[PDB]
C-alpha cells in the first residue's frame, strides 16, 4: 500500500447544493453531492461559495449528479476560476435532494 | 507528493460527440465529454474515430454523461477493441450538448 497526501473541503455551492471534495495525491479529486437544489436557472452561476484555490482544476470539469428517488439527472461545471455553473434543468421553489460521486484531475 | 506518467488523447468519436481522455500512471483514465450528439440510434456503433490502443480498456467500460440544460442522461460503452457504442436514447437531427466526467481502469 502506497501513502499519499489527502486534503478535504466542504463547499456550500449555493441554492442548497452541498459539495464534499476529497483530493488525494494533490491531483485526483472525488466530489460528493449533498443537500437539495432549488431556484436555479440553467447555465447560471450558483449563488454560494466558490471552490478554494487548492481544489481548482486547470481546465473545466463537468460532474454528473442525480436527483434522489427520481430518474432525472443534473450536472455542474467547476471552472478553473473557482466558480460553479449549474447545468441541470430549471429548478423551481421546491427543493430536490441531490446526490452523486464525480471525479476529476487538477494537473 | 508522488509524480506519475501522464498521457493524453482526444477522440472525435463521431456524431458530434468529442472525447477528452487523460490516462495517469498507465491505468486511471478520466474521460471528459464534449461536443453535441445527433443522429444516433440506441446500441449503434458511433460513426467516428475509434479509441487508440494505449487507451483501450481490457474489459468494457460504461461511462455516464449528461445533456446540458436538461434532466436527461446517456451512457457510452468503450469496448476493448476500441469501438464506442451509443447507449442513450435515440437522438434525431437536433444536436444536444453532451458533458460529463467518467473514469475507468485499463488493467
Amino acid at each position: 500500500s502506497i501513502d499519499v497526501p489527502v486534503q478535504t473541503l466542504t463547499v456550500e455551492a449555493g441554492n442548497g447544493l452541498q459539495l464534499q471534495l476529497t483530493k488525494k495525491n494533490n491531483d485526483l479529486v472525488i466530489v460528493r453531492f449533498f443537500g437539495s437544489v432549488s431556484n436555479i436557472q440553467k447555465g447560471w452561476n450558483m449563488s454560494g461559495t466558490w471552490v478554494d484555490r487548492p481544489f481548482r482544476p486547470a481546465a473545466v470539469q463537468s460532474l454528473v449528479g442525480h436527483f434522489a428517488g427520481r430518474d432525472t439527472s443534473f450536472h455542474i461545471d467547476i471552472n478553473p476560476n473557482g466558480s460553479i455553473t449549474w447545468w441541470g434543468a430549471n429548478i423551481d421553489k421546491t427543493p430536490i435532494a441531490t446526490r452523486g460521486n464525480g471525479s476529476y484531475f487538477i494537473k | 507528493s508522488i509524480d506519475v506518467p501522464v498521457q493524453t488523447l482526444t477522440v472525435e468519436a463521431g456524431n458530434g460527440l468529442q472525447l477528452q481522455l487523460t490516462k495517469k500512471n498507465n491505468d486511471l483514465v478520466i474521460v471528459r465529454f464534449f461536443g453535441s450528439v445527433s443522429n444516433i440510434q440506441k446500441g449503434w456503433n458511433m460513426s467516428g474515430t475509434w479509441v487508440d490502443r494505449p487507451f483501450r480498456p481490457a474489459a468494457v467500460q460504461s461511462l455516464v454523461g449528461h445533456f446540458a440544460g436538461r434532466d436527461t442522461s446517456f451512457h457510452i460503452d468503450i469496448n476493448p477493441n476500441g469501438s464506442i457504442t451509443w447507449w442513450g436514447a435515440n437522438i434525431d437531427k437536433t444536436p444536444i450538448a453532451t458533458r460529463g466526467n467518467g473514469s475507468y481502469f485499463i488493467k
Partner: nanobody
Amino acid sequence: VQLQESGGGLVQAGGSLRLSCTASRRTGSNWCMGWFRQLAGKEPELVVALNFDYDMTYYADSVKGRFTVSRDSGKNTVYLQMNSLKPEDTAIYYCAARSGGFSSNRELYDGWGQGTQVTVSS
C-alpha cells in the same frame, strides 16, 4: 482594452437596431457575453447573454422573442439584433463578459464596456 462596443444610437418606434461587442481575451471556461439594461433611475438588469462553450442563450421576460443574440466563430464577438422596439426600452446598454456562466450580479464580469446610448422615438 477588455471590450469594444459599436452600434446603437437613435431609432424609430417598432424599428430595429444592432449592437456589437468583441473581446480581446478569454479569461476561462463557460465564457459568456451579453448586455445589461439600466433604465433611467432604475436598477440595472441582465437582459441578454450567450455561453460560447455551450451555444445557449438567456433572454429577459420583457425582451423574449423580440431580441436575438448570436456569434460568428473565432471572432470572440456577440451580436445583438433588436426588433419591435418599444418606447420603454430606451436605456444605456452595457456590454459585459465573464467566465463562469450567467449572473444577475454586476459582480465580476472581467470585461465591462463603457456603454452605448439607445433611444427609441415614437
